[PDB]
From Swiss-Prot, chains A, B:
Protein name (database record): Spike protein S2'
Gene: S
Positions of glycan attachment: 18, 42
Described purpose of this protein according to its UniProt entry: Subunit of the fusion protein that is processed upon entry into the host cell. Mediates fusion of the virion and cellular membranes by functioning as a class I viral fusion protein. Contains a viral fusion peptide that is unmasked after S2 cleavage. This cleavage can occur at the cell membrane by host TMPRSS2 or during endocytosis by host CSTL. In either case, this triggers an extensive and irreversible conformational change that leads to fusion of the viral envelope with the cellular cytoplasmic membrane, releasing viral genomic RNA into the host cell cytoplasm.
Origin species: Severe acute respiratory syndrome coronavirus 2
Amino acid sequence: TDNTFVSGNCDVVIGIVNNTVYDPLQPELDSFKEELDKYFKNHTS
Amino acid sequence: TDNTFVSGNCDVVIGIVNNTVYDPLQPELDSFKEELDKYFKNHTS
């Protein structure tokens, strides 16, 4: 997301292809979720 | 981290020095992560 910028939509550019744009904030928050998932077993016990 | 970019490693640079690069996202996420730990702390209490 730092190396690219969002403009227009996918129906304008001629020849646009599909692919996944890596967002650095997604795994950082998901890694927090996995560490927060450990509290689910503490609630059961 | 916003004013610099990561390229290569420390072994390929001649004259590189060691320092601490301040991440502006580090204290904002950690302070809010403590809000996530204390919230799920009430979930287990």
